Design a binder for this molecule. Sequence first.
Ligand SMILES: O=c1cc(CSCc2ccc(Cl)cc2)[nH]c(=S)[nH]1
Length: 133
Amino acid sequence: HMCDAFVGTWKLVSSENFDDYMKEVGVGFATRKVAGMAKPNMIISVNGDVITIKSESTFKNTEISFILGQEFDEVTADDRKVKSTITLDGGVLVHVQKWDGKSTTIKRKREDDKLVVECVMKGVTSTRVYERA
Ligand SMILES: O=c1cc(CSCc2ccc(Cl)cc2)[nH]c(=S)[nH]1
């Protein structure tokens, strides 16, 4: 029942500062423009200890499956090949991605009826708000 309140199908409804986050990560111009337009659905499910997070959009469909605390290699939507570890910290899913000596952290939390995604790269934060689909 760890992640019960995350399970379901969620649709992006707002984004702030995502272009600056993508710049800080190193995403190139064309990918930033097309990725910034996307209105993904995020589909979260749990089966035993395995959590699956799917993102589906007109830009790029992604899927990760993982066990909390157990590192996994991930190909991001912008085509980085990263090493990821996701943990639960005080009810927040904390997702750290490492690549090329760099690191970014994505936090996913339930706030009221929303799922709030905070993406941080150094000093730059983007907030993406999802509602139930
Ligand atoms: O599941 C998720 C994860 C995130 C983390 S940044 C992903 C991402 C990265 C690069 C590009 Cl070009 C587009 C997208 N943001 C939302 S909204 N949902």
